[PDB]
């Protein structure tokens, strides 16, 4: 199974800060990586698919990039509603392995 | 980043890459060092004129997306449009069909003159 690694494990940021989360795969998965967000007591919500494509309705502040075995999620303007647990998932081959989760909370 | 621009559509599919032909089209034209620069400049004009002549001879002068009359032979390629225009890149298609280039050029050249002759004949009446 393809193993997914996230970094940083946790982070504290204030409103308006720029947040960067890195995700790594042991094997190439082309660019089939998706970034999801989870709030406490709520199911995951997709933000990014294809490693650079923004889901419809999501604010433009969220962006994704990368290549090879390294992908990056960037939140340019952190807002009160964006705090939570972010996950990176690979959907190139079964099983679709998730990351360990990056928890962004209020400083 | 400047992801979109000039050759930014190289990694995209043929259907998506066909929407931005103009950005590639524009840039095709533009003491010892001066000699080298002049020699380099002399070749670009020749290449551009060769491409323009080749386009014009087939009857697609002044057109970026021009279809023609010659039918497609199944021997050259068997893949259908379903897995070509949205499941393949231009580089892959060119690599696959780089062997069979000249025959279609000759067919287009011989087909254009027949249309010209027919148009003259119809206008004669």
């Amino acid at each position: 199974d393809i193993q997914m690694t996230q970094s940083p494990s946790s982070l504290s940021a204030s409103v308006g800060d720029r947040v960067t989360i890195t995700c790594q795969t042991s094997q190439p998965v082309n660019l089939w990586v998706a970034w999801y967000q989870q709030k406490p007591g709520k199911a995951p919500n997709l933000l990014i698919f294809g490693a650079s494509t923004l889901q419809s309705g999501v604010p433009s502040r969220f962006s994704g990039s990368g290549a090879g075995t390294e992908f990056i999620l960037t939140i340019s303007n952190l807002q009160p509603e964006d705090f939570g647990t972010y996950f990176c998932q690979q959907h190139h081959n079964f099983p679709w392995t998730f990351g360990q989760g990056t928890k962004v909370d209020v400083k | 980043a400047v992801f979109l621009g000039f050759l930014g559509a190289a990694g995209s599919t043929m259907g998506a890459a066909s929407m931005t032909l103009t950005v590639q089209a524009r840039n095709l034209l533009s003491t010892v060092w001066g000699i080298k620069q002049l020699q380099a400049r002399v070749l670009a004009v020749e290449r551009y004129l060769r491409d323009q002549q080749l386009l014009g001879i087939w009857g697609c002068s002044g057109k970026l997306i021009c279809c023609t009359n010659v039918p497609w032979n199944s021997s050259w390629s068997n893949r259908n449009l379903s897995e070509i225009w949205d499941n393949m890149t231009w580089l892959q298609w060119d690599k696959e069909i780089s062997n069979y280039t000249q025959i279609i050029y000759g067919l287009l050249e011989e087909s254009q003159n027949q249309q010209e002759k027919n148009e003259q004949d119809l206008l004669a009446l």
Partner: protein
């Protein structure tokens, strides 16, 4: 059923490998920027998303083009300068014994000789100081180059300081740059971009050490065309630079002698004060840390339990045997024996001092029959530089012994250019294309 027909598309994004002639882009010097185009203040680079390219630093034509252009510029710069043809005369030389140390005994010779003047009838007796490496015994000495060829004196106004140069491709072509870190110069690069021109590259000329170069962004990198074969050099790129301070402390004095109508030869009149050897200083702890990183990286390719030895150079010409460079117009050759001297086994403020010898008759490139005379510089000289890479050569390498010894390399200057253009390639576009479509004309 398919009923497909041929369609012509102009402007298809397809490229193929090709070779062409690049031109200048720059922001009195040997590297003439007068004929070089101005550089754009805001260069444009376009990252190509989801594009993978093939790269091979050992087959780049840009290195050959740069070498040819540099040689041509060097040849052009020396054309309008005085030719020292009359200098081939019988010199009468003696040892200088005025305030010298033990190590600088016999290094300088006080030589007197006759010479022409503005009038072809008269002659004048003059004297000067020469280096032992420049005079060969025929009490009567002669210049080393007299029996090979007569070369020109470098004009004093031009400066040898390197200047950054950007290489730009012509219209209809493109330059692809690999932005993927940890890329070892050969293989598939998945992160690619298109750049109108190459970043600034200083044409620094040196041997056994890369000076004022570019630093790796991740860690120490090792590159080689065929690491198994010993005949191919190894290029090591550092992560952090090492400061090296070189200095000539002698207080030189310059005097002009009129050898003809509008022709002057510059000679070293006399030395003021004490006479001491020029030398360079390198930090010890920083060098030890850099060598630790280098051996750690080398263990990856040459086993985890092998012994890694650094030793002296094998031999050959002075240019290849010693660390040769130029500072402030003076050509230094330093003895890098205290640096590459150690052994490594798998498991404060002192500085290493390298003595150096100055030379005036120079053959910069590997050519015979074209030397160059460097006029003396007035006053003491000092400079500081960054060491950011090495050129290493493996000795032997047979399976009989498990000990690996590496020695300094150099000589060929193409390696200096290859260390900067390893992440660049040139392609030509093929806009025209043919496809199937459902139209009908």
């Amino acid at each position: 059923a398919e009923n497909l027909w041929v369609t012509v598309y102009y402007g298809v994004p397809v490229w193929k490998d090709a070779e062409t002639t690049l031109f200048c882009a720059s922001d009195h010097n040997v590297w003439a920027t007068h004929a070089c185009v101005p550089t754009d203040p805001n260069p444009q680079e376009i990252h190509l998303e989801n594009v993978t390219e093939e790269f091979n630093m050992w087959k780049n034509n840009m290195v050959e083009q740069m070498h040819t252009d540099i040689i041509s510029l060097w040849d052009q710069s020396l054309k309008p300068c005085v030719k020292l043809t009359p200098l081939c005369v019988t010199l009468q030389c003696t040892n200088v014994t005025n305030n010298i140390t033990d190590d600088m005994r016999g290094e300088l010779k006080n030589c007197s000789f006759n010479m022409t003047t503005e009038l072809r009838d008269k002659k004048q007796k003059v004297y000067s100081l020469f280096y032992r490496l420049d005079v060969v015994q025929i009490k009567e000495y002669r210049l080393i180059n007299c029996n090979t060829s007569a070369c020109t004196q470098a004009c004093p106004k031009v400066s040898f300081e390197p200047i950054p140069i950007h290489y730009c491709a012509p219209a209809g072509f493109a330059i692809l740059k690999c932005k993927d870190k940890k890329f070892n110069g050969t293989g598939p690069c998945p992160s690619v971009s298109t750049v109108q021109c190459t970043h600034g590259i200083k044409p620094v000329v040196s041997t056994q050490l890369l000076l004022n170069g570019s630093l790796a962004e991740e860690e120490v990198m090792i590159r080689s065309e065929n690491i198994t074969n010993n005949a191919k050099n190894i290029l090591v790129q550092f992560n952090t630079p090492v400061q090296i301070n070189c200095t000539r402390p002698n207080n030189n004095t310059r005097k002009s002698i009129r050898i003809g109508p509008g022709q002057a030869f510059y000679a070293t009149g006399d030395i003021i004060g004490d006479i001491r050897q020029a030398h360079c200083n390198v930090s010890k702890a920083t060098w030890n840390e850099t060598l630790g990183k280098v051996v750690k990286q080398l263990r990856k390719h040459f086993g985890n339990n092998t012994i890694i030895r650094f030793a002296n150079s094998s031999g050959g010409d002075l240019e290849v045997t010693t660390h040769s460079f130029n500072c402030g117009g003076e050509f230094f050759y330093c003895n890098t024996s205290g640096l590459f001297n150690s052994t490594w086994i798998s498991n404060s403020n002192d500085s290493i001092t390298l003595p150096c010898r100055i030379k005036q008759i120079i053959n910069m490139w590997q050519r015979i029959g074209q030397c160059m005379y460097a006029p003396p510089i007035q006053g003491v000289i000092r400079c500081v530089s960054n060491i950011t890479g090495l050129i290493l050569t493996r000795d032997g390498g047979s399976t009989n012994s498990t000990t690996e010894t590496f020695r300094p390399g150099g000589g060929d200057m193409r390696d200096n250019w290859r260390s900067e253009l390893y992440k660049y390639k040139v392609v030509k576009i093929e806009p025209l294309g043919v496809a199937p479509t459902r139209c009908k004309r």
